[PDB]
C-alpha cells in the first residue's frame, strides 16, 4: 500500500530541540559501534545519529552510490578497482583526522580472525591479497594501497574481477565503513569486541556523538562539534528501548517522538492515536522458515549438510512449507503490513521481483499431503500422523518470542502441520527469547536439537544474497550446501550479469531453484511504519535523504 514517507511539517523548527527516539526490542541494547563486529538490526538503526556505524557513502533513493558524503568511490572497469576518497575535513568526534589507515583498519577488523568477527565472505576474497591475509599467509593486504600514505585521504582497492553490484550500497565486494585506528590500536585484537572503547566510549564520525551510553538501554547524542556536514538543529537526541508491551503505552503517554521498528500488529492501535503522524515505506526486510540441515565448520569455514532428519528429503521440506496458513495470519493480525513472500528477494528490489515466481504464499494442504505420500510417509489412520518405515514423522519447532499473538500463531502452525500428518512441538515447550535464539543459531557449530525455526532480517541494500546463503556463509542457519544454488548465487554476480536483462534471469532462476529446493521457506515481506509526533519537523523515511539527522527538529512540547 501507500503511506507518507515524509511527515511534511510546515511549522518551522526551534534552535535547541531535545528529540526522544526509541526502537522496539525486548532484548537489551547490544551496543557495538564497529560495523564489522556487529550483527544486530536494533543497533544498526540506533547508531544512526552517530553516522550509522561510521558509513562513508551517500546514496540516491535506490541505494546507488552518489557523490557528496563522507567519501566518494570511483569504480573503473579497465583497472578493476575502486578508488575511495576521504573528505579532507572528515574527523572523528574527539577531533582526530579520519585518514587512509582508518578505512583499511575496517578490513583488518573483519579479515583478521583475531578480532572474532562473523562478517567475512567469499566476496571479500575477490579483493587482491586479502584472502591470503585472512588465512595468515601474508601480513598485509596487497590489494589495498595508500596513494598518499596512511595519514592521506585516498585508498585504492584493486579487485580480481569486477562485479555488477559495485555501483550500489551493501554489495559486500568492498567495505563502506571506517574504524578509529589510533583510539583502538593499543587494545588487544581479541579484546576489542567487548572493550569500552567500542561499546560504551566510542569515537564516531556522524553528526552527533554519544556523550553517555547506558549499556543495554540508551544513548545520549549531542551534536558532534567536529562534523564535516551541516550543523544540526537539535541540542540532544536520546535513543532507547522500548519493549513491545510498553510501546503503545509510551505513545499514548507521549514519551517518544519517534519509535522505529514496531511490530506490524500494533499499527491498528497506533493509527487511532492522535498527536502522531504515521509514516511508512517498503521495508528492506525478509522473514524466513529455517530447516536445520547440518552445521558450520569454522576451522575450514564451510557449511556441511549432515544433520540426520526427514527434512533432508525435498518433498518433506516442500510439504511443511505448503502447509502453513501465512495469508490467514497476516490478514488476521498484520493489518496489511506483511505480505506473504513468493521468494527471497523483497519487492523493494522491484527490478528483480516477478509474479512468474510461485512460492509458498498459497496454502496447499492437498499438494503437501501428496508430496508426503509420494515419499513413503504413510498416514497412520489410528493416530493421524505419518509413519515411514518404523519412525513417526515428528519435528521440533524453535519458534521465537514476539507480540501478544506470538503464542497463538505458533500453535496455529502446529494445527496446519497436524492437518498433513506431521507432529510438531515447541522447543523446550516454550517460545524462545531472542538473544538466546541468536546464540542458539548464530554461534558455531550449530544446535543439534531443533528441526524448524523462524528468522527475520534487515537485508543489505544490494539484492545479492551471497552473505546469507553461500557455502562459506556463517549466516546460513539451515547449513545447506548445494552446488546448483552456489552456481545461481555466483551467476547473479557474474561478468554476464552486468547486462541487467541477464541478471534479471539469474535472479529468477535463483528464486525458483531456492523455492523448489525448499531449504528455506520464505514467510513475509513487510511495509515499515514509524509514528512521528506532530511537533517534529524535517522527518522522513526517504532512502536517499542523507541529512535527516542534521535537518530534523522540534517545536516545543509533544502532542
Amino acid at each position: 500500500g501507500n503511506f507518507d514517507v515524509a511527515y511534511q511539517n510546515p511549522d518551522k523548527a526551534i534552535k535547541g530541540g531535545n528529540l526522544k527516539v526509541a526502537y522496539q526490542s525486548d532484548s537489551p541494547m547490544k551496543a557495538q559501534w564497529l560495523s564489522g563486529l556487529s550483527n544486530d538490526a536494533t543497533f544498526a538503526t540506533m547508531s544512526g545519529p552517530g553516522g550509522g556505524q561510521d558509513g562513508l557513502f551517500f546514496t540516491d533513493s535506490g541505494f546507488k552510490f552518489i557523490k557528496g558524503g563522507a567519501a566518494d568511490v570511483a569504480l573503473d572497469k579497465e583497472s578493476k578497482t575502486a578508488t575511495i576518497t576521504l573528505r579532507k575535513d572528515l574527523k572523528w568526534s574527539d577531533g582526530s583526522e579520519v585518514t587512509a589507515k582508518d578505512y583499511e583498519f575496517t578490513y583488518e577488523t573483519i579479515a583478521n580472525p583475531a578480532y572474532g568477527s562473523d562478517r567475512w565472505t567469499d566476496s571479500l576474497a575477490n579483493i587482491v591479497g586479502l584472502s591470503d591475509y585472512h588465512t595468515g599467509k601474508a601480513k598485509t593486504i596487497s590489494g589495498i594501497t595508500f596513494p598518499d600514505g596512511e595519514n592521506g585521504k585516498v585508498i585504492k582497492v584493486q579487485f580480481k574481477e569486477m562485479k555488477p553490484g559495485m555501483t550500489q550500497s551493501g554489495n559486500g565486494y568492498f567495505l563502506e565503513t571506517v574504524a578509529p585506528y589510533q583510539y583502538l590500536k593499543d587494545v588487544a585484537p581479541k579484546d576489542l569486541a567487548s572493550s569500552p572503547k567500542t561499546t560504551t566510549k566510542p569515537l564516531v564520525t556522524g553528526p552527533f556523538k554519544p556523550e553517555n551510553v547506558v549499556a543495554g538501554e540508551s544513548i545520549k547524542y549531542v551534536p558532534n562539534p567536529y562534523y564535516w556536514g551541516e550543523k544540526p538543529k537539535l541540542n540532544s537526541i536520546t535513543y532507547e528501548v522500548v519493549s513491545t508491551a510498553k510501546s503503545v503505552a509510551a505513545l499514548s503517554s507521549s514519551k517518544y517522538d519517534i519509535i522505529n521498528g514496531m511490530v506490524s500488529s500494533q499499527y491498528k492501535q497506533v493509527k487511532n492515536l492522535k498527536g502522531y503522524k504515521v509514516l511508512g515505506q517498503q521495508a528492506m526486510y525478509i522473514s524466513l522458515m529455517y530447516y536445520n540441515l547440518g552445521h558450520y565448520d569454522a576451522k575450514n569455514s564451510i557449511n556441511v549438510q549432515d544433520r540426520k532428519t526427514p527434512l533432508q528429503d525435498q518433498n518433506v521440506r516442500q510439504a511443511i512449507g505448503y502447509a502453513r496458513n501465512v495469508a490467514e495470519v497476516d490478514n488476521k493480525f498484520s493489518n496489511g503490513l506483511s505480505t506473504p513472500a513468493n521468494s527471497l528477494i523483497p519487492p523493494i528490489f522491484k527490478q528483480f521481483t516477478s509474479s512468474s515466481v510461485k512460492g509458498y504464499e498459497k496454502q496447499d494442504l492437498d499438494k503437501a499431503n501428496k508430496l508426503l505420500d509420494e515419499d513413503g510417509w504413510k498416514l497412520n489412520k489410528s493416530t493421524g500422523y505419518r509413519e515411514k518405515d518404523g519412525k513417526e514423522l515428528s519435528l521440533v519447532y524453535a519458534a521465537r518470542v514476539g507480540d501478544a499473538n506470538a503464542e497463538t500463531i505458533a500453535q496455529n502452525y502446529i494445527q496446519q502441520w497436524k492437518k498433513i500428518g506431521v507432529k510438531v512441538s515447541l522447543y523446550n515447550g516454550k517460545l524462545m527469547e531472542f538473544n538466546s535464539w541468536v546464540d542458539h543459531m548464530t554461534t558455531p557449530p550449530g544446535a543439534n536439537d531443533w528441526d524448524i525455526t523462524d528468522g527475520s532480517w534487515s537485508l543489505a541494500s544490494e539484492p545479492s544474497q551471497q552473505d546469507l546463503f553461500s557455502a562459506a556463509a556463517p549466516y546460513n542457519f539451515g547449513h545447506f550446501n548445494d552446488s546448483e544454488i552456489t552456481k545461481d548465487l555466483n551467476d547473479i554476480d557474474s561478468a554476464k550479469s552486468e547486462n541487467p536483462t541477464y541478471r534479471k534471469a539469474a535472479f529468477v532462476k535463483y528464486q525458483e531453484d531456492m523455492n523448489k529446493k525448499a531449504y528455506v521457506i520464505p514467510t513475509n515481506f513487510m511495509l515499515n511504519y514509524t509514528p512521528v509526533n506532530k511537533r517534529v519537523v524535517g522527518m522522513t523515511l526517504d532512502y536517499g535523504a542523507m541529512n535527516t539527522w542534521s535537518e530534523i527538529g522540534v517545536s516545543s512540547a509533544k502532542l
Binding site: 560495523s35 538490526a41 526486510y285 514476539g402 531472542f434 527475520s456 534487515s458 549466516y475
Partner: peptide
C-alpha cells in the same frame, strides 16, 4: 546498508 538480524516476523 548491510545484512542485520531482526526480532520481527
Amino acid at each position: 546498508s548491510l545484512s542485520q538480524l531482526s526480532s520481527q516476523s
